[PDB]
């Protein structure tokens, strides 16, 4: 098929979807070839021992995007950035002016997960969580690993399967407590957090290491 253009995707789906639900899923974000390439790069990082442990049995590594062997991860990151730019400050009241590096995370099966939590509960400036899933042929029925979100104000929770080539946005603050349910296969995800300029400048969190 022909993928929806980035600008149209942002203005006619992501913006309205986020503002209505605070959660937004875009399936088939970059296509099979690019998705599998990202997977090859992440599996290379895992196989070369770049991951280190990060309530949760996750292993993580941070990717700037320019490192040799992470070109396709860099493309993913620039694509996320293009989507955020296209949103043209229509994501709630946020003035988005920065982001973290990419957090590559692995739950190495065997029932590993992440207990229910809020990404940013202390006002540290992160307003949007952006996650890309790269797990080829992942089936929650077999391997679990669902991301369960408990949107505030709603009785029903939202179950997000970590599907291959799947992009997810959600509000990082207390509106969206969430948990990674136990994973029974190797589960890879790439997360970027985007910052609201003013909240971040408030410096509610001071890092000393």
């Amino acid at each position: 098929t022909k993928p929806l253009p980035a600008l149209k995707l942002a203005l006619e789906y992501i913006v309205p979807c986020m503002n209505k639900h605070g959660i937004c899923v875009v399936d088939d974000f970059l296509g099979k070839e690019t998705g599998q390439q990202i997977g090859d790069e992440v599996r290379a990082l895992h196989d070369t021992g770049k991951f280190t442990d990060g309530i949760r049995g996750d292993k993580i590594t941070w990717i700037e995007g320019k490192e040799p062997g992470c070109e396709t991860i860099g493309l993913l990151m620039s694509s996320m950035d293009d989507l955020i730019r296209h949103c043209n400050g229509k994501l709630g009241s946020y003035k988005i002016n920065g982001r973290t590096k990419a957090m590559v995370a692995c739950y190495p099966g065997n029932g590993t997960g992440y207990v229910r939590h809020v990404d940013n509960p202390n006002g540290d400036g992160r307003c949007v969580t952006c996650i890309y899933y790269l797990n080829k042929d992942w089936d929650a029925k077999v391997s679990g690993g669902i991301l369960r979100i408990f949107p505030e104000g709603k009785a029903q929770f939202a179950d997000i399967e970590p599907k291959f080539d799947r992009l997810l946005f959600f509000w990082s603050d207390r509106r969206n407590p969430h948990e990674v349910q136990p994973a029974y296969a190797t589960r890879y995800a790439i997360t970027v957090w985007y910052f609201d300029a003013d909240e971040r400048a408030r410096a509610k969190v001071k890092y000393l290491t």
Binding site: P3, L9, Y13, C17, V26, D27, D28
Partner: peptide, 13 residues
């Protein structure tokens, strides 16, 4: 090309 607005999933292709 169709978004069911009561849901939060759409396929780009």
């Amino acid at each position: 090309x169709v978004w069911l607005t009561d849901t939060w999933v759409l396929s780009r292709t």
